[PDB]
Amino acid sequence: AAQKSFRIKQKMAKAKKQNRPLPQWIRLRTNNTIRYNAKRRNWRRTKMNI
Amino acid sequence: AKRTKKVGITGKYGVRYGSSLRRQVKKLEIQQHARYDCSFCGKKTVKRGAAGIWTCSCCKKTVAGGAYTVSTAAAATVRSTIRRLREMVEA
Amino acid sequence: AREITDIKQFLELTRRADVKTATVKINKKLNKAGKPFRQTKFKVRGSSSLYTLVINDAGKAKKLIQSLPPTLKVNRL
Amino acid sequence: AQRVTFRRRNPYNTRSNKIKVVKTPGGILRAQHVKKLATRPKCGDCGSALQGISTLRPRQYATVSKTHKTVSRAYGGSRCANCVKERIIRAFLIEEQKIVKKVVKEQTEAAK
Amino acid sequence: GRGAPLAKVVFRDPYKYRLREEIFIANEGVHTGQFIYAGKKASLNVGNVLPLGSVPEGTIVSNVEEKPGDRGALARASGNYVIIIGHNPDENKTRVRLPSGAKKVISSDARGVIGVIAGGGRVDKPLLKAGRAFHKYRLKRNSWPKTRGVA
Amino acid sequence: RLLAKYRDAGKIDKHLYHVLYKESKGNAFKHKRALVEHIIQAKADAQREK
RNA sequence: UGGUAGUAGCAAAUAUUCAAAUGAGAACUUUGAAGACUGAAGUGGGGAAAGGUUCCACGUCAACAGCAGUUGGACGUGGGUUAGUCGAUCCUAAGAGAUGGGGAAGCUCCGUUUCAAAGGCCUGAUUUUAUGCAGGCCACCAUCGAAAGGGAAUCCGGUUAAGAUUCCGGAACCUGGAUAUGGAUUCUUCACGGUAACGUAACUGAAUGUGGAGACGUCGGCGCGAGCCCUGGGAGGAGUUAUCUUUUCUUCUUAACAGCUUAUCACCCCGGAAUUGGUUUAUCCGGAGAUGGGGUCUUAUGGCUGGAAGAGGCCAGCACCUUUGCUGGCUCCGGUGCGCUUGUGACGGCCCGUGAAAAUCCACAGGAAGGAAUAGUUUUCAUGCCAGGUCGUACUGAUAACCGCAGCAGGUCUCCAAGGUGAACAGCCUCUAGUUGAUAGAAUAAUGUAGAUAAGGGAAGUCGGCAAAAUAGAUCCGUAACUUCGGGAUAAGGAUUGGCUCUAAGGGUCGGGUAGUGAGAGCCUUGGUCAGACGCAGCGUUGUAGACGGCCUUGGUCUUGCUACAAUUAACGAUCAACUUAGAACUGGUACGGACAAGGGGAAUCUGACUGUCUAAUUAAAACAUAGCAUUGCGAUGGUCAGAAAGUGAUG
């Protein structure tokens, strides 16, 4: 941490690209129940445990 | 002067440890920290480290000896026994 | 990184076919305690180190500037 | 004063991580990491450092010419001179004394 | 962790050209540069190592083998020694006296080095403080301090 | 080093050097001036015994 | 979902104020002006562990920031981490763990060099031979395990909204591989010099062996070096000026690398010692050869030069809607040290503690093999050429970025380190740096918490002087019983302590002559000789300076050979930095360790000898430990103990 292996950084890359809200166009789509993103992992609330 | 009356070097221990024990440790530190004659170079330069080891300061030698003195009294007789025993092989 | 005292060694270096760049630097320093005078430094770039030549008397320096081969690219100051 | 920092990423005061403080041409104090000090080669027999040998770290000795690693005697960069002198004297005199051991037993074995 | 000092005696390998270094327990009074003679016909001087069938009785040897070739079992700690008190040349046995005062008959092909063991009189000095016993037992094993089982 | 340079100037011989050196190793000399006075004292004594 | 209740409360960390800007709206945002704080064992600069985007920018104010909000470690959208040299990679440590084997119904257990036929290395065979075969050797015997141990290699300056020992400019070095050009050697084929210690840019060398480096505790003082601190002269810029002050602050810097040179230590040669002598703060050395004289060596260091002033720094001018500068200067000469920190050299103390290993690299012994000159050898000499892969790199490292459910007065390893007082890294105040954040306003009742101060008496309070008070720094005097003779002891108990003007002591560096002479190895100067050259200036012109100087000199030009006189005596004269100690007057509303800091002591008893250790969240003790004493078992086909077993295991 500040000096890392590669595997942990690869999972941080995935944890970055998932840390975003819904696309705005899905809420218009037919038969939609998804109203927000129920998996927003912040860094002040949830530690991902690698 | 003579700064201590009867403790000597064991005055570094102080008031602790009894009197007979400090007298007993004195008896062996006067042998241990002393400076002995080297039998080969003839110089009084033998000091010890590392109990049982007597390194000459000059002359590079090292005598494995007694732990506090260069050759203890129960050892220096043994070689005289050897001096008795090796003479009977020839005569 | 090196310093050269000889002149003919420097002339041997300027024709060594790796030396593509040289430069002439003109310093303004003072002799023994009194007077300002003109020092020059000839720096040839060998491919490993940068050789120099320190000339204090400029009466050798004008002859030496003339004595450089003209195929050598010279940065003047 | 100007308080300085480590340059590498090792924060502890180990034997590898030593620091000199140097003024740099920008005027500022800055740290310089200093390699451990090289030790002189020693005689294997008398323990004295033997002279004529450049004192370098052990992989520096492959960057150097052979005359900074050697003196011009037999047993040059390995043993100090006196010991070499002694192992000539001894190695002469016994190989004279042994010849005495070959001249006594030509006569004592013959006069028996 | 050992009261006696060692002795790194170096021998010539008889079958390949090299030197083999061997760690004896130093007897008392072996200066460095002493030639140490291992073997049957070796003379009887302080530091030589000999078979027990080659020495006379009353000889004060140490580092003596139990069975011939286990390389130094009996009488190794500092100050100690065994004393050959008799021979039995029939079926080549030797009767010795161990440091505890137990007499014992062993084989006369076992090897003992002549002389008492260097470092003698090590426990005649008091160990005055607890820290000195700590620094004694930090180099042997974890057997200190001993809590009483009544406590 | 004052005894050293007085010997190197030849003002004092080496016998009195080896006496006054071991005396200076004790107290025997409160300062520089007392030692100069003690040099001149013993030198005048050996001069009167000459 | 209530009553409770719009109450308990949002009070530790000395602390905020004024004006302007944005805005619907500023106790809280931004700038400026004040005022303070941490005060360099910092509320400062970097990091390890940990977090993972929080770093940085634009926009937004629903929710969160237990008040506020136009602000944010929030929300929305994007941007950002560049390495041959930093680390990981490689090595082994305590240890883990295959293979061979041995158990176990089996999951799996033991063991790690072991009851195992456990593999590669260079030369020859080549011109079927592709690189197999004929040998000569050698035997170690997996693998993992330390981004704090071992280790091949870099630094400076600049640069971005966020990266830099990584990018850019310059300057280097290491490893691996190629081949040439020189130089060296050679018909004395595989170098010479030095009495020697050893030196030279080079100066064959296999298998095998040996040695060195890697390789190393801790404490103490001494020497040297670096950086900081302090200080003098000089060259700039700012502040103060009612008065005074040659004033107060600030800038004046130099890297990696390379060449030459040098300091202890060590060694060689001549030489010979007692009328014992060298010599350290610390007492060790010398006929196993001192002191003395002359040398050799190492180079962390230091110095000079190159890098490199063309860099950075501090100023000045001419300007410039803006872009962007351009032109100039200077950047110099020193000194001190029980100073602070740090590195090291030689020592000295300590031990029934004597204080890692391997990789890697080098050297020597050895002599296989190969090599001459019409030229073969030489890449551990100079130069040149080519290449250096992968992964990490942003930021915080904490009274908001980690863990404690939280933006929790807790907890978490380390480096740097300023001025004054002062013994001090104590407390107290300031500089560089960073903050000004911890809901506010008004009053200031009871009872609280935190700090105080009290007439007279003095523990009479109380289970008990519990809590406070009192002493306390330094200097000088004086110090009992008892004792293991070391202590007890800062025992007890007294006396001083400012400011000012002085006095005495405590140290260094060079000079030890007059006269006649040589070189005054300064040669000045008058004269030139011709390198009299660089460069300036002007319409090769034919003017400028000759660097105002190698070279030749008629001498007035404070270092001296040789002797004269006789040189020698008291040992001096000049001169410069340190502070320490002792005393005297004089003076102050009798004060003066003026704040801070900072022992109460004695007479005894019970108990444990002591230093130490534990019930982390009620027990820190007379308990546990301890050294000391004593006992018991055991001679390894063993004593104590483990295992479900084993061709097992701990002490070992």
UniProtKB/Swiss-Prot annotation, chain A:
One of its GO terms (molecular function) is structural constituent of ribosome. Pfam families: Ribosomal_L39. It is found in: Cytoplasm. Gene3D superfamilies: Ribosomal protein L39e. Residues 6-19 have a biased composition (Basic residues). One of its GO terms (biological process) is cytoplasmic translation. Keywords: Cytoplasm, Ribonucleoprotein, Ribosomal protein. Signal peptide: none annotated. PANTHER family: LARGE RIBOSOMAL SUBUNIT PROTEIN EL39, RIBOSOMAL PROTEIN L39E. Component of the ribosome, a large ribonucleoprotein complex responsible for the synthesis of proteins in the cell. The small ribosomal subunit (SSU) binds messenger RNAs (mRNAs) and translates the encoded message by selecting cognate aminoacyl-transfer RNA (tRNA) molecules. The large subunit (LSU) contains the ribosomal catalytic site termed the peptidyl transferase center (PTC), which catalyzes the formation of peptide bonds, thereby polymerizing the amino acids delivered by tRNAs into a polypeptide chain. This is Large ribosomal subunit protein eL39.
Swiss-Prot record, chain B:
Its main location: cytoplasm. The modification Phosphoserine is found at S39. A zinc finger (C4-type) spans 38-59. One of its GO terms (molecular function) is structural constituent of ribosome. It holds the Pfam family Ribosomal_L37ae. GO terms for biological process: cytoplasmic translation. It comes from the Eukaryota. Keywords: Cytoplasm, Metal-binding, Phosphoprotein, Ribonucleoprotein, Ribosomal protein, Zinc, Zinc-finger. GO terms for cellular component: cytosol; cytosolic large ribosomal subunit. SUPFAM superfamilies: Zn-binding ribosomal proteins. It is found in: Cytoplasm. Belongs to the eukaryotic ribosomal protein eL43 family. NCBIfam families: eL43_euk_arch, PRK03976.1. PANTHER family: 60S RIBOSOMAL PROTEIN L37A, LARGE RIBOSOMAL SUBUNIT PROTEIN EL43. Component of the large ribosomal subunit (LSU). Mature yeast ribosomes consist of a small (40S) and a large (60S) subunit. The 40S small subunit contains 1 molecule of ribosomal RNA (18S rRNA) and 33 different proteins (encoded by 57 genes). The large 60S subunit contains 3 rRNA molecules (25S, 5.8S and 5S rRNA) and 46 different proteins (encoded by 81 genes). Present with 44600 molecules/cell in log phase SD medium. There are 2 genes for eL43 in yeast. This is Large ribosomal subunit protein eL43A. It comes from Saccharomyces cerevisiae (strain ATCC 204508 / S288c) (Baker's yeast). The gene is RPL43A.
UniProtKB/Swiss-Prot annotation, chain C:
Pfam families: Ribosomal_L38e (PF01781). GO terms for molecular function: structural constituent of ribosome. The keyword Ligase does not apply. It is found in: Cytoplasm. The keyword 4Fe-4S does not apply. One of its GO terms (cellular component) is cytosolic large ribosomal subunit. Gene3D superfamilies: 3.30.720.90. Keywords: Cytoplasm, Ribonucleoprotein, Ribosomal protein. One of its GO terms (biological process) is cytoplasmic translation. Belongs to the eukaryotic ribosomal protein eL38 family. Component of the ribosome, a large ribonucleoprotein complex responsible for the synthesis of proteins in the cell. The small ribosomal subunit (SSU) binds messenger RNAs (mRNAs) and translates the encoded message by selecting cognate aminoacyl-transfer RNA (tRNA) molecules. The large subunit (LSU) contains the ribosomal catalytic site termed the peptidyl transferase center (PTC), which catalyzes the formation of peptide bonds, thereby polymerizing the amino acids delivered by tRNAs into a polypeptide chain. Component of the large ribosomal subunit (LSU). Mature yeast ribosomes consist of a small (40S) and a large (60S) subunit. The 40S small subunit contains 1 molecule of ribosomal RNA (18S rRNA) and 33 different proteins (encoded by 57 genes). The large 60S subunit contains 3 rRNA molecules (25S, 5.8S and 5S rRNA) and 46 different proteins (encoded by 81 genes). Present with 50200 molecules/cell in log phase SD medium. This is Large ribosomal subunit protein eL38.
UniProtKB/Swiss-Prot annotation, chain F:
There is a cross-link at K43 (Glycyl lysine isopeptide (Lys-Gly) (interchain with G-Cter in ubiquitin)). It is found in: Cytoplasm. Component of the ribosome, a large ribonucleoprotein complex responsible for the synthesis of proteins in the cell. The small ribosomal subunit (SSU) binds messenger RNAs (mRNAs) and translates the encoded message by selecting cognate aminoacyl-transfer RNA (tRNA) molecules. The large subunit (LSU) contains the ribosomal catalytic site termed the peptidyl transferase center (PTC), which catalyzes the formation of peptide bonds, thereby polymerizing the amino acids delivered by tRNAs into a polypeptide chain. Belongs to the eukaryotic ribosomal protein eL19 family. Component of the large ribosomal subunit (LSU). Mature yeast ribosomes consist of a small (40S) and a large (60S) subunit. The 40S small subunit contains 1 molecule of ribosomal RNA (18S rRNA) and 33 different proteins (encoded by 57 genes). The large 60S subunit contains 3 rRNA molecules (25S, 5.8S and 5S rRNA) and 46 different proteins (encoded by 81 genes). eL19 lies in close proximity to the binding site for eukaryotic initiation factor eIF4G. Present with 97700 molecules/cell in log phase SD medium. There are 2 genes for eL19 in yeast. This is Large ribosomal subunit protein eL19A. It comes from Saccharomyces cerevisiae (strain ATCC 204508 / S288c) (Baker's yeast). The chain holds residues 104 to 153 of 189 of the full protein.
